[PDB]
Amino acid sequence: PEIVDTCSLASPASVCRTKHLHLRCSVDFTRRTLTGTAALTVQSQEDNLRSLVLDTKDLTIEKVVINGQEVKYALGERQSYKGSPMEISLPIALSKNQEIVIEISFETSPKSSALQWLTPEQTSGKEHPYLFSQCQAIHCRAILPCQDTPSVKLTYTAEVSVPKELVALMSAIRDGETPDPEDPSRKIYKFIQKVPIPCYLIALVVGALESRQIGPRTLVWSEKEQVEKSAYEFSETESMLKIAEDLGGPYVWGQYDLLVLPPSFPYGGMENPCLTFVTPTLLAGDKSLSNVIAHQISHSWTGNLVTNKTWDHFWLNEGHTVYLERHICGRLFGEKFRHFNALGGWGELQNSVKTFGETHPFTKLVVDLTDIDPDVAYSSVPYEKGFALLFYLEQLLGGPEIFLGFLKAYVEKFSYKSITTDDWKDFLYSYFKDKVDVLNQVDWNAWLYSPGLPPIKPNYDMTLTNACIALSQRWITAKEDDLNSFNATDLKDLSSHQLNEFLAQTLQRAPLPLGHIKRMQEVYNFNAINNSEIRFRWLRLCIQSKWEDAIPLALKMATEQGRMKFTRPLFKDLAAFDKSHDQAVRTYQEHKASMHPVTAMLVGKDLKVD
Ligand SMILES: [Yb+3]
Ligand SMILES: [Zn+2]
């Protein structure tokens, strides 16, 4: 009764399980390689085990040692994005539950899809280079040989040699630093992760980093030039940790540090344990994008403690975490705000479903990733169809206090484990046994397995949304002789969040007439806003509405940062505008070599430029 991880080529957890990784490596900026040894402590789950298979991607293997002697191994043919399977022949057959240590000597490729190597010119300080990883979903195999499946959890320790002017950090507790005895131009940084984790949570950064304390268990890390602004921007972090602990139970990870990466970091935030990674596009100056912090914090329960068994079940990670995120922000800013953000998320789902099409398999809640790259299937669907299901169930079963009791019991039940949608569903029924007649009203096949918008829409408070819709509708319904009526005062009682939702509402009906968009800049001066979420939607509205003056502004945002949420749609919208098409493509081609490897692939696909 085992389950299949169709994104991994390694032996499954039913055959063998990695219990620990000891990584010893050196970061070579002249070669853009990580070189070292991965010592995997492996437990047999079978009688008479005589071989096993690991995932690899663009790794060079030097040798494999067990019991102090080299052993036979073979690398199979590459399977596209999944990489190449590595079969290791064990020297003595293992009994069930026997544990051995396998030490693999390897080197990464400069093209490693897990890594971006930055030159000094690409950093803030301009003197030193920089390295960062991103393993979720299936890029840990492009760093080191492993069972690259979230169905397996392991502890780890590491020693990382770097040029002595730089700092290494990992998703782990810091365990000291020392000069490298093999090379006095280097330092060795040590790390320990004593909580078992899925390997997609392994993370590394190397650069000219400094730290500032912002709470009792939190330092923010960045280059010098960003430290002061980051400490302010993220100053709600400890209050959010305290709320999260109330909702999910104790925080088990020791430290909660934050790392603010350079602008090409591909995501808004990644929940690497003990060291969340975030985009610098969160530095709005007013703490207004802190829901991304609340999301990563929440993963310290839903995701890092309770984990999806395979990426087909990614909605478990994300839906529950958006649910908790929105509760943290509702406790800080009020229940009307929670419903505002919830309703907005439904808008996002509407957008995503229209983009893929209402029958598309990537619009199912549980996806089948057989032969699909997870990076391509990735979308807002698991987040927002997931959230919508849990919000619907909250309403069905008695409200937020009652549903939060379920969430905490779910985290407790499945801590340190990896689970499927059916495990989740079974526990829901158990917990809610005295409401099973309500539960049986749910159309489970449609919500879990059908494409498109869900079969039923929750109920949402409208208080904070109403002014956004009203203003949007005034603009959409305006004719030329109404344009004079608009004025800066129209925005005076709108928060940044409400201005963003006004633009989202308006973008859903784009294009508008060019003269309307010019009027908007004349009276609202949106070109002056630096909030990245607001600028992104404004520039999309401008390019879809065929305003040539917006072309250079959209090109610049698309290239001067690399969060894919912003760069992919800006490039797509520029390619679709005939006036900007040729330049969009020439700009992608010019920048491709120095982009994040996954962002480069996905922008190329989006533009049909191979
Ligand atoms: Yb009129
Ligand atoms: Zn997440």
Side-chain angles (χ1 to χ4, degrees), residues 136 269 271 295-296 299 314 317-318 321 383:
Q136 196 186 68
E271 66 267 24
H295 181 105
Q296 306 340 125
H299 276 305
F314 185 50
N317 276 27
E318 301 305 333
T321 294
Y383 300 81

Side-chain angles (χ1 to χ4, degrees), residues 465-526:
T465 302
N466 280 156
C468 307
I469 291 179
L471 187 58
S472 186
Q473 284 299 122
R474 283 189 66 201
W475 277 97
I476 290 155
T477 67
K479 313 310 188 276
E480 178 176 313
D481 65 2
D482 301 309
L483 296 174
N484 181 74
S485 65
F486 301 110
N487 186 279
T489 61
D490 302 334
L491 308 183
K492 75 185 205 297
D493 295 304
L494 300 181
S495 68
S496 62
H497 303 95
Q498 290 179 300
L499 242 43
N500 191 53
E501 184 58 25
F502 161 74
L503 287 161
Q505 286 288 159
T506 305
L507 185 62
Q508 290 193 135
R509 285 84 182 171
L512 273 61
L514 179 58
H516 284 45
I517 299 315
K518 294 172 169 174
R519 184 71 175 157
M520 229 172 250
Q521 170 50 212
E522 185 179 354
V523 296
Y524 298 156
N525 193 193
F526 290 152

Side-chain angles (χ1 to χ4, degrees), residues 88-361:
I88 301 168
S89 292
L90 308 177
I92 309 175
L94 306 183
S95 61
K96 190 168 172 153
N97 293 323
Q98 191 186 343
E99 299 180 14
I100 67 164
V101 181
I102 309 177
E103 184 194 61
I104 304 160
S105 301
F106 71 95
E107 178 176 274
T108 61
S109 173
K111 72 195 255 179
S112 175
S113 56
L115 303 175
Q116 186 172 12
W117 297 86
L118 303 173
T119 64
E121 299 181 343
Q122 292 175 287
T123 70
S124 287
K126 312 295 176 176
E127 166 162 339
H128 300 295
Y130 189 115
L131 174 66
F132 70 82
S133 71
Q134 174 53 221
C135 291
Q136 196 186 68
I138 53 161
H139 297 283
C140 191
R141 58 184 82 169
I143 306 179
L144 56 91
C146 53
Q147 300 179 274
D148 188 10
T149 170
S151 66
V152 173
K153 298 196 178 190
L154 59 139
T155 50
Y156 79 85
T157 41
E159 298 178 35
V160 184
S161 174
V162 309
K164 74 176 203 197
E165 305 87 3
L166 303 182
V167 176
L169 306 169
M170 295 194 79
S171 55
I173 300 294
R174 295 178 307 140
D175 191 30
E177 63 171 89
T178 202
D180 186 338
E182 289 156 350
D183 188 344
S185 73
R186 304 182 69 89
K187 286 167 167 197
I188 298 170
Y189 285 95
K190 304 183 177 173
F191 305 95
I192 181 138
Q193 180 54 263
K194 67 172 197 31
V195 180
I197 55 158
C199 61
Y200 74 83
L201 292 178
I202 298 166
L204 177 64
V205 59
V206 184
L209 297 170
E210 303 201 338
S211 66
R212 173 162 164 203
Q213 185 155 190
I214 63 169
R217 49 181 158 184
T218 305
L219 308 192
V220 64
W221 297 86
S222 69
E223 289 188 78
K224 184 180 180 178
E225 296 80 4
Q226 280 71 231
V227 173
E228 187 179 294
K229 183 169 199 191
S230 299
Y232 178 85
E233 200 76 44
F234 303 133
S235 66
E236 304 156 316
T237 294
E238 178 63 16
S239 68
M240 294 179 163
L241 283 159
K242 286 192 178 184
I243 295 160
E245 285 185 303
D246 184 38
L247 302 180
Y251 178 78
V252 309
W253 303 94
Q255 198 77 2
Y256 185 82
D257 282 0
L258 287 172
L259 174 67
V260 190
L261 283 297
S264 66
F265 187 63
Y267 296 116
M270 177 68 212
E271 66 267 24
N272 303 132
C274 309
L275 188 63
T276 278
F277 284 25
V278 299
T279 178
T281 64
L282 303 186
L283 300 174
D286 62 1
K287 318 189 194 194
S288 64
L289 304 179
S290 73
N291 75 291
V292 176
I293 311 304
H295 181 105
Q296 306 340 125
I297 287 171
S298 290
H299 276 305
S300 312
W301 294 267
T302 48
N304 300 358
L305 270 191
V306 186
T307 303
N308 47 209
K309 191 168 178 275
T310 76
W311 299 114
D312 293 358
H313 301 277
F314 185 50
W315 85 271
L316 291 172
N317 276 27
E318 301 305 333
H320 287 91
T321 294
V322 173
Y323 189 80
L324 282 181
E325 167 197 333
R326 285 178 182 154
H327 274 296
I328 291 170
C329 293
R331 294 260 307 252
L332 290 173
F333 303 113
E335 177 77 347
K336 290 176 171 358
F337 190 57
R338 188 178 68 112
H339 279 242
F340 174 87
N341 290 139
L343 182 51
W346 180 274
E348 179 57 28
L349 184 57
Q350 296 176 131
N351 287 359
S352 177
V353 169
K354 207 169 161 180
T355 298
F356 285 130
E358 68 188 4
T359 66
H360 192 110

Side-chain angles (χ1 to χ4, degrees), residues 35-46:
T35 74
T37 51
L40 305 166
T41 302
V42 180
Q43 189 188 55
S44 181
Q45 299 300 292
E46 304 194 329

